[PDB]
Design a protein around this motif. Structure first.
Motif, PDB file in Angstrom:
ATOM      1  N   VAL A  49      -2.314   0.992  -4.228  1.00 33.67           N
ATOM      2  CA  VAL A  49      -2.093  -0.593  -4.016  1.00 33.67           C
ATOM      3  C   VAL A  49      -1.481  -1.308  -4.659  1.00 33.67           C
ATOM      4  CG1 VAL A  49      -2.743  -2.651  -3.016  1.00 33.67           C
ATOM      5  CG2 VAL A  49      -4.255  -0.437  -2.280  1.00 33.67           C
ATOM      6  N   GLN A  90      -3.727   7.584  -2.919  1.00 31.23           N
ATOM      7  CA  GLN A  90      -3.245   6.306  -2.435  1.00 31.23           C
ATOM      8  C   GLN A  90      -3.245   4.948  -3.221  1.00 31.23           C
ATOM      9  OE1 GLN A  90      -5.580   4.890   1.252  1.00 31.23           O
ATOM     10  NE2 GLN A  90      -5.782   6.914   1.429  1.00 31.23           N
ATOM     11  N   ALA A 143       1.005  -1.748   0.219  1.00 29.24           N
ATOM     12  CA  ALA A 143       0.200  -0.408  -0.251  1.00 29.24           C
ATOM     13  C   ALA A 143       1.429   1.107  -0.071  1.00 29.24           C
ATOM     14  CB  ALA A 143      -0.976   0.223   1.325  1.00 29.24           C
TER      15      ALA A 143
END
Lengths: 409, 204
Positions: free
Chosen positions: A405, A403, A251
């Protein structure tokens, strides 16, 4: 690509969704809709749930109300989308049978995923040297180059995944609207590219400020900070965290601070050069063709799949191209990126694109260049000689955050 | 708020608390909130908040935190847009500076009790022995939002024990083209789906 934006904006049917009712308005002045039917689909994050097809019978400048069957109840987490298309059954003097003339898409119900990530009986092992942080989980290794602060290499089994380290990217291979009428032998200070060059956006260097690596109860947490500076001035501050969890997913969290007095950065994202060259690019987002923050409306949200070649838009004058926005999932080779981002996957570096004067002089580079933008400035286009990017498409908010992943797949 | 996730980890120089909540109603998740608290060795608590809003749910009025402080202090001192009450779509008069007002003047005595006193663009807030830093809007008062919502007249409000403090990462515009048909322009509606803000809470 842009031609499809025109087609969408100039379509002759306007749609308005209210509950189960679709209001279709004809913008024809003289002809009645006597060769059209409305095809509609409901999908859950790219999965088809329902569909139907309604003969579209609208008088010139009139309206038809089409009520949809009780639409499927979102099985699980995700966003339902409603897509409608006006298709022309019969061929005409100027079109093939099945010609799509108009379309529109909407968001319907959405289920937020409150499902907890499954626990894994394994904690990435963190080895620390003076050169790097070496994280190992199963057959995966991550190597953070402790002298640079960037993820420098990743192994799957034993295959190195990167050619170029994962780094912050703020510049764009100037578009024609960024360049305008500015020339090497006659500069036009107002052109975005001049502002960026003057600000040293294309020259700023990353000073590693912070660098730490911590072991969590079930993860490894890498935290770094960089100062992108030029001639003593800090232009950007970038704070990043990497959380390697026990399922092998990384992450990434990125926080960016932009100096308010510095021309708004072209983009805010990451990029790297993948060792892997794969055939198809598969992704969930707005597509299939190239689309930009201020040129999105034609693009449809769906699961798209294109041979890598079609990600690149062969503009005669090489420039940044191929961005796809609103992407929630990107699959390439044996890599999967998830989140909410724009991305640009190609065989040419931004640098090469910026340098090269003609399309035919480009050289496919080894591996695959991948840009993942959290934010991206609009492309403009009111004219190509005076900065025409509207304020709401300029990256002027100062503080940014996104963000991402990155897992295998 | 359904507690989804709850963990506490020791870092090389800090404590990291991570939680997640699902704000649900009649089986539907409306909001998901993921928060991290980093207590560092200087005694500062860094709070990070991530919010997911269900797209099919009327845009939330605000996205922030609140609590009730035991401390009642005299003056409110802060760096941001002021000095008087200002809102996302009513900012332009406000000036950015270091302001300082007796707590009473943070409250705007509207005859019909409602949310009031928000100050936007705040980078630093000092109250009593507490300092908040970041970039936020805040509303500090003696009345809970609940009390304000319930009370019909200004003169029926009762100053509650302690101090109510709301700190918004995001806040919906107040509108005002007319007061009988939703007049909040799209760009002042909290419609972005994913939200994020950070807040540093230290003593001072």
């Amino acid at each position: 690509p842009a031609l499809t934006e025109a087609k969408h904006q100039q379509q002759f049917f306007q749609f308005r969704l209210s509950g189960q009712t679709i209001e279709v308005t004809s913008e024809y002045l003289f002809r009645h809709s006597d060769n059209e039917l409305l095809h509609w689909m409901v999908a859950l994050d790219g999965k088809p749930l329902a569909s139907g097809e309604v003969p579209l019978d609208v008088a010139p400048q009139g309206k038809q109300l089409i009520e949809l069957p009780e639409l499927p109840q979102p099985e699980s987490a995700g966003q339902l989308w409603l897509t409608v298309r006006v298709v022309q059954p019969n061929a005409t003097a100027w079109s093939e049978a099945g010609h799509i003339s108009a379309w529109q898409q909407w968001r319907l119900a959405e289920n937020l995923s409150v499902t907890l990530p499954a626990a894994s009986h394994a904690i990435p092992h963190l080895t620390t040297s003076e050169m790097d942080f070496c994280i190992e989980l199963g057959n995966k290794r991550w190597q953070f180059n402790r002298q640079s602060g960037f993820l420098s290499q990743m192994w799957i089994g034993d295959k190195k995944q990167l050619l170029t380290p994962l780094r912050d990217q703020f510049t764009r291979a100037p578009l024609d609207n960024d360049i305008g009428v500015s020339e090497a032998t006659r500069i036009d200070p107002n052109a975005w590219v001049e502002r960026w060059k003057a600000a040293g956006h294309y020259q700023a260097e990353a000073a590693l400020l912070q660098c730490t690596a911590d072991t969590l109860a079930d993860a490894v947490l890498i935290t770094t900070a960089h100062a992108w500076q030029h001639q003593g001035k800090t232009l950007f501050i970038s704070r990043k965290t990497y959380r390697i969890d026990g399922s092998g997913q990384m992450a990434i969290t990125v926080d960016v601070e932009v100096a308010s007095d510095t021309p708004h950065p072209a983009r805010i994202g990451l990029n790297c050069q993948l060792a892997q060259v794969a055939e198809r690019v598969n992704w969930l987002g707005l597509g299939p063709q190239e689309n930009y923050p201020d040129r999105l409306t034609a693009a449809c949200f769906d699961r798209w799949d294109l041979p890598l070649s079609d990600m690149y838009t062969p503009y005669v004058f090489p420039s940044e191209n191929g961005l796809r926005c609103g992407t929630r999932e990107l699959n390439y080779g044996p890599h999967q990126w998830r989140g909410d981002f724009q991305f640009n996957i190609s065989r040419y570096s931004q640098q090469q694109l910026m340098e090269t004067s003609h399309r035919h002089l480009l050289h496919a580079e080894e591996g695959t260049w991948l840009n993942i933008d959290g934010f991206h400035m609009g492309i403009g286009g009111d004219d190509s000689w005076s900065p025409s990017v509207s304020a709401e498409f300029q990256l002027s908010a100062g503080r940014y955050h996104y963000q991402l992943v990155w897992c295998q797949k």
